[PDB]
Amino acid sequence: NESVLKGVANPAEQVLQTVDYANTRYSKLDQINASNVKNLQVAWTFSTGVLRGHEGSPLVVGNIMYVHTPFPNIVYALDLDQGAKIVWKYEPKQDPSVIPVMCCDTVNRGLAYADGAILLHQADTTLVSLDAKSGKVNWSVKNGDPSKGETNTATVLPVKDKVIVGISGGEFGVQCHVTAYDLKSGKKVWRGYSIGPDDQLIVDPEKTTSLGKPIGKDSSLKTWEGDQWKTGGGCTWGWFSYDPKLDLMYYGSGNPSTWNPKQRPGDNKWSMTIWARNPDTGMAKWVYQMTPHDEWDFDGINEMILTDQKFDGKDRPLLTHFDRNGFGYTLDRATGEVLVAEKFDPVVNWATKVDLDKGSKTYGRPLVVSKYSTEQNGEDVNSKGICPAALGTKDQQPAAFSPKTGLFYVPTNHVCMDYEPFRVTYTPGQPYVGATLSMYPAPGSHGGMGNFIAWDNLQGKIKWSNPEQFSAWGGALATAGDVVFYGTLEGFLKAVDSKTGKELYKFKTPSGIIGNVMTYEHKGKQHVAVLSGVGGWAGIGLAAGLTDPNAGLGAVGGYAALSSYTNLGGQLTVFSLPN
C-alpha cells in the first residue's frame, strides 16, 4: 500500500515486521550509535500475559504501539502517549486443537499495518483486518483448515490494494501456497501454489525462467510421482519482500512433504525454491530451486534481502538469501540469475558446493555428498554427522543488512544432526514426517551452537564471526549508528559494532529472545525494543514441556542446557538513553 511506503519513509515508525519492503532490517535512526550505546538503559517494560515463544516485533504506527502474542495471538494496542496504557485489546477465539497441529511451538511472527488497519494472521489460518484506532474487525477470512493440519505462523505482506499471506504445514502433508486477499473487503484474488499443475502454480511455461531458461510445461508435475504433490509441502511461513520498481514480490517455499526421501522420488518442485511473483496476478516471472529433492528438511523460506550493490563493477538489483542448507545465495532479483552461492558456516558438509558453471550439466544444483545423504543411506538407516541440522545454519530469525558497511549480519546456528528416515503413510490431520533426529553441537569450533557473523554477499565470505554458547534464534537489526542488535537464547540483548564486531552492550532480558529487535522514535527520542520469551524449535523443550531426548523432533535433547539459563516468558523490553 501507499500507506506502507509512507511508513517506511518515516524512520520513527515500524509498519512492517521486515522494517522495509526490501527486508533489509536497517533503520536510519542514529541517536543510539556506537559511541553511546554503552549508556543504553531500560525505559519501560510490558508483559503480554502469554507464555511459550514470542517471535516477531511490535509495530509502532504514529504514537501507538501494537504488540502481538503467540497462540491465541492476542493483539494489544499501547498508547505511547498515555504511558503505554492498553487502549484496545483483541483476544481471538481459536480451537486449542490447533496447537498439536503445529510443527514447532505456538509462535506467531507479527502483524502488519496498511490503510489504517492492523493485519493479523491467526494460528488457525484466519486472516483478520482490525481497525488501527479501535480494534474493531473490518473482515475475517479463513485461509485454510487446521483439520487437515494447516496452520499459520508467518506475517502478511500488504502490497497496493492486496494482502499476500502464507500457510504452514510442511510437516503435515499440506499442499501449501500463497494467497492474495483484497485489502478493503478480504475477498480472495489469486492463489499461487508452490507445487502442482501449472494453473495452480500460476506460472507461464514459456516466459517463467529458471536459471535463465524457461521452465516449460508441467515444470512441477514432472518431478513428482503420481498424486503425492497433493500432499507435497513447500510451505510459505517465512518473510516476504517486494520491489515496487520491478513489480515483484519474493518469498521462499518450504520442505517437500515428508522427511523420508525414498518414498518421494524426483526433484519435488517447486519446494525449496525462491519465488518472484506479480503481486496483482500472482504470475511468477522467475523461480529458482535451492535444495532439489530434499533429504534434510532445509526449508527454503528464509528472507530475501533486496539490495542495490555493485557486482563486477555494475550496479545490479540483487537478492541475498541465507538458506537453511548453509548456503548464502546472491541472485539478480530481476532475472533470477544466481551470482554467488557459498557456505556461511565452514562446517556445512551435506554438499561440496553449488555448481555455478554455466555449462556444467549440473548448473544451479548442489553437489550432494553421498556420505551425508539420507536417501542414499536408505530408509531406517541413521545418517550420522550431517551439518547443519534440520533447523539449518539459519532458521526463521531474519538477518540484517548495513548499506554503510555493505555487510550482512546473520544470526546463525552451529548444530549437526543424526538423521534416520522411515516410510510413513499419510493421514489427514496427522503428522507426515517419517524421521527420528538427534541434534548436537558441531564437533569443531568451541562447543557453541551459534554464531553472529558478518557476510559479504558479492564474494561470499565471512568478514568476522562472533561465537555464542547457544543458537542465535533472534532477529538482528542494523542502524545508521553503526550498531547491530540481536538477542541470545540465554536472554541477552547484545549490540555489536557494525564494522569491528566488538560487543558494546549486553543486558539480560527476562527470557530467551527469539523475536526480532526493532527501533522507533517517540517525542523525538529513539527507543529500541525487543520481545523476550524462549520458544520456537530451539526452545521447544521448554515450551512444550518435552522430557525425551528425541521428542520435539530432536531439538528437545539438543538444547537441554538451555533450561539452566531461561524459563518461559512473555515480556516486551524497551531501551533508550538517559535524558
Ligand SMILES: O=C(O)c1cc(C(=O)O)c2c(n1)C(=O)C(=O)c1cc(C(=O)O)[nH]c1-2
Ligand atoms: O514446513 C513447515 O510447515 C514449517 C513451519 C514452521 C512454522 O510454521 O513455524 C517451521 C518449520 N516448518 C521448520 O522446519 C522449522 O524448522 C521451524 C522452526 C520454527 C520456529 O518457530 O523457530 N518454526 C518452524
Ligand SMILES: [La+3]
Ligand atoms: La519444515
